[PDB]
Design a protein around this ligand. Structure first.
Ligand SMILES: O=C[C@H](O)[C@@H](O)[C@H](O)[C@H](O)COP(=O)(O)O
Ligand SMILES: O=C[C@H](O)[C@@H](O)[C@H](O)[C@H](O)COP(=O)(O)O
Ligand SMILES: N[C@@H](CCC(=O)O)C(=O)O
Lengths: 655, 658
């Protein structure tokens, strides 16, 4: 889900400029949830903007943001020409995991039929059922099936039983969160407090941007406990930007204030003050990073930019002149890591495949047991963990609920924890003892592509550090590092086969299933390839360990079943050729991803995808890219949007 | 593929009786699959059996053993009434590898047109190219494309170049195998050694059964290295009468006798003058005569129409057999006799590794959680093929379990030898007596589910499941804090046979589901926790038996991609049981329904909520959480069975040649 609000204080904006700002804000956050959207702004049609802050209009519609963009416009009651010197508007895009994505269930929610209080919410309230019964007895009627409504019906209950006639908006929100259980990120708006906003969080991101041509009173807001706020000095011109992510604010300003758990920010009279019952900083992001450029989709950009993102992952860490590796995030802990006795990798989805993809080389260069676990199952079994375990947590977002819960589980047992993330300041990067930022740049496509290859490389670099004191492994280290030096250019060679991959897609897009087979270093490749094809093309693709064919799954192969096989020139080549002969004996006609020089395979197979040869423990990077491209072209042929796959969104931060 | 030979020594048998014994033997070996079969025996219609020991007759044919039986009795120039006091007949079912199926490529292969030597062979001789060239240069002509023929020609080469006129049949075979490369099980017969047999193996099973109404000389045959006297071989003491049975599978011997000798690699067994001796080339090493508990009834369909149906519906009995003598339901204790001398060491180790293939691997996934809970040790579950590819680190304080119904699976066996070299304590969980994995592990447990004749693993899965739970119960038997948990689990084991019958009584409900999926090409099977393995195992069964694209999906992973497959057309089966993951499973159900999925749910009989909100539900009885996996997988076994029947497939049919 995504949160965005626009508060213009004494900055005259017309009602159109405001709505186009809310919509444009949801467009930046749409990849986090695109089942339904909605906005909340001040209604009425009075020239004097002051006589309009007593009427709250809500426009909510099912579908992507483009469905709300058109619902907002071409309306017969709203006059988009009213000038507002002061105004507050809130917006929200929802990932409807449960129930129907109906306008009633979308945000902002409301507290009554007159819209006295409206709130937008990211997260889950674990006790909303108790709150719902308590509020129903006091005379409040519920309309939607969402847990967010209990927050709106409750903030009004604290308002209908206050002690003084002028209790600050903060005091009301403070009493609410004390009754809420779970994780949440909230932004309130009310008619009683015109232009006032309140932002509190607890286990979910929520920052506050700010723009003003004038100077700010401070760059360090002092947190308070139940003059001294952030605001322009001489004049009042200020624009705030509440948001759950930075991509929605970077286009307007690069000055934000990342809140923390139970911090209740409040903008009053155009002054930001934090209450709790704190550091205006510059963002290191460029807008170009979250633009499609000349590509028609984000996913295509992020696939073709992998030559660059791989380089950025190694920048300032790998030195090819003297063959050294240094990960600054691990300098103070690498010594203690080497005294540990087991490595555990915990992650979800594609991030889990990155651990499968590097498990073998990690076992080789560290000589330690390496265990790779799906976060959800890791938690279900209450896996044993000990004080001399090193536990890695791979997460592009750094907020995945299952991976994050596994982190807190391993900390409670005294393990040394390491974070491999692509999001600075994320929960996983903050709560681990050390870690590495893969530095692949923002990923907007729902399906992770460059995050996978950058996680791959990051884990290889770690493996290189763990063995830099072994004489017997020096040549092996050099071999790997030379492969890393040549990897960006070999990726470019793979991308140049884009047209050849597209032609093969035209022969498969009509099929219902496809089996992808590989072993050894390329077990992860066929699992990741099968997940991508599932995710964006909706074909029933499955990854099958090649060594397991003879134990049952080979029965599913016939001349009609599509098959893709990975046969690279490493120590499993002969066994892979054996599996290929098994498939052919069952009349299968597979597409083979093989090496350019593999002349034997190229002659005896009609359809081959010839990738350049790299070091055996890096080849997985070059073998997965063809399957990234195949999934893209397959999705285009089937008429689906690669950036917005049905039934989900990016980053699973809730149950 | 299948070997069987019958040697009657001073037990008079007619030629008809001998041939009916060979045919009956091969009928016990058909379930392994084959394309051709043949037999070899003494021909000639001289009433004195002693004069016919120089004319070997062969009857080989492409097709099923039944057709071979017709060809036998369909011989005008053969008299079936001759009585042989001594005789050796051999028989073979072939699974073609080198040479296409045909009468010429069928076994027994011969050494020349006069049939001076014949041999039946299971396996492949790798260097059959080099050997064929050498024999062709010495003046030997081949008539088949089989690698086996080089064995028949080579033994004659050794005979034609023997230094002494009385070189033993054993010596000739020793020189043959010293020149062979690969895997083989062999039985030899020759006119120059009438009434004698020689069997040897390398990497392929070969056993010998014995029967006599007289006392035998010993139950432990000492090995002989390069004097054969009364004190070194097996024979009837006071009289000559005795019968020997060579076979590659005990299923072909058990109806005649239950006393068998399992040969080992490079053993050369020979019967000379009705006496059995075992030779090698290189405290007192020897081979034991042991008693199999196998019964002919265990390898017969009975009233069932298929072995798959039998083995699914007898799981109440096989589960009981797995627990017999091991779980005391009078004082609630567990004792696995196979681990008595090692349970002490095992409890001092620091990690458990389970290594297996296919369904046996799923049995490790199905018990990983309870093993972690009751042992408190790290438990790692590994597919044997990937375990080898990665050169997984293993240490001296690891306990490595090797799960294999057959006890012969190549990758699992190579995993075992890998772990032994690194000093790990090794444990075999097998269902085949005499198998390589049961012999080479430090200790082991025979799951005792009875022979598995069906093509897919059904009772072996649930019997492995139970065996590993029993081991987990042993490991925590000294912990006060776990007594209640152990009792809860053991009462679940006590009730499990009756709960399986209760699930089998819902067969009619499963048939209704099969008709719903009859026309479908894919189905997703979703679950988590204790039932992750149920999804993988059910998906494998439906793939293997029904040939449709079933896939197991970890429910906790849906929102990370796989949920995109859900719509109103994709069939889904979800497992929702009453354990600690119930709420999370309900969560996954709402995620599927919200996207137009209409899944079938396997749930508890008393889960009234899900039964009302879901159209079709398979309602199994509730058991202990770490045992529900057995009850929830059986509806998927039956589903695979019924779907295959509806589509006209032969569930007992397994489904290139150089
Ligand atoms: O293509 C699939 C997606 O990339 C998805 O499977 C992703 O890998 C998980 O959602 C993990 O999320 P994070 O690694 O970002 O926490
Ligand atoms: O239905 C599955 C089959 O039974 C097959 O997958 C089998 O489980 C493996 O070939 C392992 O065989 P073993 O149990 O003999 O090791
Ligand atoms: N390799 C031999 C025997 C194969 C077998 O029956 O296992 C052949 O093809 O004739």
């Amino acid at each position: 889900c995504g949160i965005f609000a626009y508060l213009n204080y004494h900055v005259p904006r017309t009602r159109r400029e405001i709505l186009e700002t809310l919509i444009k804000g949801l467009q930046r956050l749409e990849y986090r949830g695109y089942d339904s959207a909605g906005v909340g702004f001040d209604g009425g049609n009075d020239k004097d903007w002051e006589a309009n802050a007593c009427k709250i209009q809500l426009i909510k519609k099912k579908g992507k943001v483009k469905a709300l963009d058109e619902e907002v416009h071409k309306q017969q009651d709203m006059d988009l020409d009213i000038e507002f010197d002061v105004h507050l508007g809130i917006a929200h895009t929802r990932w409807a995991t449960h129930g129907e994505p109906s306008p009633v269930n979308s945000h902002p929610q409301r507290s009554d039929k007159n819209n006295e209080f409206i709130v937008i919410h990211n997260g889950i309230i674990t006790n909303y059922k108790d709150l719902k019964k308590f509020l129903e007895s006091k005379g409040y009627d519920f309309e939607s099936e969402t847990d967010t409504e209990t927050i709106a019906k409750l903030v009004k209950y604290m308002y209908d039983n206050r002690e003084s006639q002028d209790t600050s908006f903060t005091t009301l929100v403070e009493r609410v969160i004390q009754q809420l259980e779970g994780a949440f990120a909230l932004v309130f708006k009310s008619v009683h407090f015109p232009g006032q906003a309140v932002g509190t969080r607890r286990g979910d991101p929520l920052l506050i941007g700010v723009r003003s041509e004038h100077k700010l009173s401070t760059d360090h807001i002092p947190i308070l406990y139940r003059t001294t706020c952030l605001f322009p000095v001489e004049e009042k011109a200020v624009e705030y930007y509440f948001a759950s992510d930075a991509s929605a604010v970077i286009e307007h300003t690069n000055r934000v204030i990342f809140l923390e758990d139970d911090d209740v920010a409040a903008v009053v009279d155009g002054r930001l003050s934090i209450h709790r019952i704190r550091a205006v900083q510059t963002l290191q992001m460029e807008l170009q990073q979250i633009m499609k450029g000349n590509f028609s989709s984000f996913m295509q950009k992020e696939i073709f930019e992998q030559p660059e993102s791989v380089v950025n992952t190694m920048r300032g860490r790998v030195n090819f002149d003297d063959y050294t590796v240094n990960l600054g995030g691990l300098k103070d802990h690498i010594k203690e890591i080497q005294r540990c006795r087991r490595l555990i990798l915990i992650a979800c989805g594609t991030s889990y495949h990155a651990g499968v993809a590097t498990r073998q080389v990690l076992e080789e260069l560290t000589e330690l047991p390496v265990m790779v676990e799906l976060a959800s199952d890791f938690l279900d079994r209450n896996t044993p963990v000990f004080r001399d375990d090193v536990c890695f947590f791979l997460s592009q977002s750094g907020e995945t609920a299952d991976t994050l819960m596994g982190l807190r589980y391993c900390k409670e047992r005294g393990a040394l924890t390491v974070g491999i993330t692509n999001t600075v300041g994320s929960s996983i990067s903050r709560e681990t003892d050390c870690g590495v930022h893969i530095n692949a740049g923002p990923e907007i496509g729902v399906a992770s592509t460059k995050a996978y290859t950058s996680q791959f490389v990051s884990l290889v670099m770690f493996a290189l550090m763990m063995c830099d004191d072994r004489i017997s492994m020096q040549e092996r280290r050099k071999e790997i590092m030379l492969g890393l030096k040549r990897l960006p250019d070999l990726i470019k060679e793979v991308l140049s086969m884009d047209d050849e991959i597209q032609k093969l897609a035209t022969e498969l897009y009509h099929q219902k299933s496809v089996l992808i087979m590989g072993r050894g270093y390329h077990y992860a490749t066929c699992l990741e390839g099968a997940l991508k094809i599932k995710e964006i093309t909706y074909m029933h693709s499955e990854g099958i360990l090649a060594g397991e064919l003879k134990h049952g799954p080979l029965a599913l192969v016939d001349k009609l079943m599509p098959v893709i096989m990975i046969i690279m020139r490493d120590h499993t080549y002969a066994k892979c050729q054996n599996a290929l002969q098994q498939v052919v004996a069952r009349q299968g006609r597979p597409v083979v991803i093989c090496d350019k020089e593999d002349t034997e395979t190229i002659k005896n197979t009609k359809r081959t995808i010839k990738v350049p040869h790299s070091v055996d423990c890096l080849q997985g990077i070059l073998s997965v890219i063809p399957l990234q491209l195949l999934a893209f072209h397959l999705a285009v042929l089937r008429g689906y949007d690669v950036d917005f796959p049905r039934n989900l969104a990016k980053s699973v931060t809730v149950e």
